Amino acid sequence: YYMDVQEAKLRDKMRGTGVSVTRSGDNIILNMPNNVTFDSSSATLKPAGANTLTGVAMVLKEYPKTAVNVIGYTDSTGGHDLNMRLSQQRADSVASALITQGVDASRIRTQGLGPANPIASNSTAEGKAQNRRVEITLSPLLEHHHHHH
Numbered sequence: 001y002y003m004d005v006q007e008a009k010l011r012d013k014m015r016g017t018g019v020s021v022t023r024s025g026d027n028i029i030l031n032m033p034n035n036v037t038f039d040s041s042s043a044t045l046k047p048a049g050a051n052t053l054t055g056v057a058m059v060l061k062e063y064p065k066t067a068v069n070v071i072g073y074t075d076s077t078g079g080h081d082l083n084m085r086l087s088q089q090r091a092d093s094v095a096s097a098l099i100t101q102g103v104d105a106s107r108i109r110t111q112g113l114g115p116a117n118p119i120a121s122n123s124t125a126e127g128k129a130q131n132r133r134v135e136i137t138l139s140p141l142l143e144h145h146h147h148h149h
Contacts, residue, residue: 002140003028006063013055017048030056030136037134043086043093053094056136057101065144068107069137070094074114075128087114090134106145 007028010021018036022029034041037049045053060066072091076083091110099105120127 002063002065003138006059006066006138009059009062010056013059014052017052017055019052027137027139030138032134032136034129034132034134037094038090041086043089045093045097050097053097054101057098057103060098060103060107060138064104064107065141066107067109067139067141068095068098068103069109069111069139071111071113071135071137073117073119073131073133073135075122075131076115077122077128080115083114084112088112094134094136107141 003023003026007021007023010028010030014021014030018033020031020033022031032049032052036052037046038044039046060068070091072087072089074083074087074090088110091112095105095108095110098108114131118127118131119133120130122128122131
């Protein structure tokens with residue numbers, strides 16, 4: 001359980017934001033289309049996206065046993081290294097926004113996995129557009145930080 005109610009909260013808050021709530025197994029995948037999060041192409045937090053990121057951050061405050069893995073995906077047509085930069089850049093923008101809103105930095109990790117896992121075809125522009133995305137992987141804290149010794 002634990003994320004059952006979170007799925008309901010996210011589904012309500014993302015009622016018409018543009019964010020696709022894909023609940024995979026136990027963890028929740030919040031994938032945000034390039035257009036709704038960023039302005040042009042560079043990591044640029046538009047008001048709409050910042051507003052939505054605030055909603056995400058709110059839920060992350062409601063349930064602090066969430067591990068926030070911000071994994072950025074993207075097509076690598078142009079320069080896989082440059083796209084890697086943008087991949088990490090985009091993830092970092094989301095993370096810093098969360099931390100700014102009040103999410104623990106120690107509960108957040110940013111991974112640029114753009115040219116790693118193709119969600120769609122990379123040869124076709126259809127998939128190329130789909131691959132360029134930011135997916136927030138909300139997983140339950142695998143063994144909370146344990147320091148009493």
